[PDB]
Design a protein around this ligand. Structure first.
Ligand code: MG
Length: 508
């Protein structure tokens, strides 16, 4: 049974009463920490999805009519919404976006999605916000609609109709699709497979809710900065579910930390045998592809074509993940022996207390929210490259990127003030000299914690290269009247208080 994975179960023993009690405690702690939304919020999501399906049909219909098709053929053309990622898995929370895919027949172009479908959304009274990003890895429209955040992508099939009955599991659907359409289909195909690959979906969901919370709190969740993201975490949980098909989620978590802490990296985590299929694309294969051999902690997607979802993991972030696995073993063991609580497991990281030195990376923009989102996105996208350059330097013991940029915005009349913002920010010694308060200047700041092992050592070259790289991406970047980029080396005693919550106090 594929549900027991590629190695067979470790144990088919069922949960005991004591284990189920630990599981009840685990669920109550998840509830206390806000993991679950209300029944009303779930209803609200279901309603917006009905509307999205209606609009997806209307979109395909309108495009079809514009290309001179009869009413019947335009109806027949169809159009269908799917969800993927956390909502589709049922592990979403009150804040969560719905990752949503719009699948359209062959005559409906990506251009049509960004014009006709985009306009259909803008005509709705329920639309709160809309931000099209036709450039992203997967071209996307991000919206808020009746208060719910929806992330919308589009895939064009090589068939003239998209009926309501359509499922995406048939790998023949991938024939004749361009790279972007393949990418677009991959998310939903993988999510759907993960669900079919675990022995008991609700055990999986509770375990994954816990790992998502744990990973966010422990600052090991962010694919962009070299940590596993949602799909990778989902697959790691799924693997352990297969090994203990009759276990309770609390037991899955204990076994998870142990197994992954002890695992023989770079040996891969795989949920089902790697499939071949009808395309000429490479499937993950460290035997024959040197890039694949380089993956440090490979977590491989099950849907054809299999790929490594954790390719971004670096030398430094691997160490952090493994450290966090070890803490998890210690703590869950203690919870099982009734010495510690689930709340102990989910305690927030102490990133800003644990290093003597930090590198601050600040992306400034003076203009619209749009070009800042684009600029910072760009700068944010390169941070992992700086980490890889820093971490291989002789003097550097670790270069540990934080997982979330600190965001800020300001009243910036001149022209002068933008200059003054770039100056007093990043150090607690000079930061107080800000206000008001908060025409606008944006900031995104990433932090890299540094551990060094005649002192120094000199990190300025990779830093300068990083700045030059980010400026290179177009002539605008590039400017200096609008876009700017700063790297600052700070001691821990001198970190800005944006970095501590009103719950901790700064070290010295
Ligand atoms: Mg998302």
């Amino acid at each position: 049974q594929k549900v027991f994975g590629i190695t067979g179960p470790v144990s088919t023993v069922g949960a005991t009463a004591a284990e189920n009690k630990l599981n009840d405690s685990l669920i109550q702690e998840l509830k206390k920490e806000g993991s679950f939304e209300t029944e009303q919020e779930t209803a609200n999501r279901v309603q917006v999805l009905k509307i999205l399906q209606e609009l997806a049909q209307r979109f395909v219909y309108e495009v079809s009519k514009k290309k001179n098709m009869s009413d019947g053929m335009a109806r027949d053309a169809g159009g269908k919404i799917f969800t993927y990622g956390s909502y589709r898995l049922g592990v979403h929370g009150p804040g969560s976006d719905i990752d949503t895919l719009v699948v359209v027949p062959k005559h409906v172009t990506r251009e049509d999605f960004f014009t006709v479908f985009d306009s259909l959304l803008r005509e709705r009274k329920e639309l709160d916000e809309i931000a099209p990003v036709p450039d992203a890895f997967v071209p996307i429209i991000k919206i808020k609609f009746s208060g719910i955040s929806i992330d919308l992508i589009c895939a064009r099939l090589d068939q003239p109709q998209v009926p309501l009955s359509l499922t995406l599991s048939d790998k023949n659907l991938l024939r004749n699709l361009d790279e972007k359409d393949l990418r677009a289909l991959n998310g939903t195909r993988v999510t759907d497979e993960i669900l079919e690959l675990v022995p008991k979906p609700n055990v999986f969901r509770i375990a994954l809710r816990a790992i998502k919370l744990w990973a966010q709190r422990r600052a090991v969740y962010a694919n962009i900065f070299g940590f596993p993201g949602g799909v990778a975490w989902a697959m790691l949980v799924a693997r352990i579910c297969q090994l203990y098909p009759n276990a309770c989620s609390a037991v899955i978590l204990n076994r998870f930390f142990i197994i992954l802490s002890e695992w023989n990296w770079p040996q891969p985590v795989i949920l089902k045998p790697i499939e071949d299929g009808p395309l000429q694309v490479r499937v993950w294969n460290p035997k024959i592809y040197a890039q694949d051999r380089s993956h440090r902690m490979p977590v491989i997607t099950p849907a054809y074509p299999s790929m490594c979802a954790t390719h971004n993991i670096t030398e430094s972030t691997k160490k952090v993940i493994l450290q966090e696995f070890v803490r998890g073993v210690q703590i869950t063991n203690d919870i099982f022996s009734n010495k510690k609580s689930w709340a102990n497991l989910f305690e927030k990281n102490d990133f800003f207390f644990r290093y003597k030195f930090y590198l601050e990376i600040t992306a400034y923009t003076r203009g619209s929210d749009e070009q800042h989102l684009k600029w910072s996105g760009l700068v944010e996208s390169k941070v992992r490259l700086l980490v890889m350059k820093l971490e291989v330097l002789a003097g550097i013991k670790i270069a540990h990127p934080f997982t979330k940029p600190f965001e800020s915005s300001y009243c910036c009349p001149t022209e002068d003030d933008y200059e003054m913002i770039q100056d007093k920010y990043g150090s607690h010694k000079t930061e107080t000299a800000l206000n008001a308060l908060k025409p606008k200047a944006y900031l995104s700041t990433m932090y890299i914690g540094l551990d060094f092992n005649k002192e120094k050592v000199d990190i300025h070259i990779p830093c300068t290269e990083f700045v030059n790289l980010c400026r290179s991406f177009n002539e605008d970047y590039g400017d200096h009247k609008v876009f700017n980029l700063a790297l600052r080396f700070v001691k821990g005693y001198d970190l800005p208080d944006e970095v501590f919550d009103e719950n901790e106090k700064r070290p010295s």
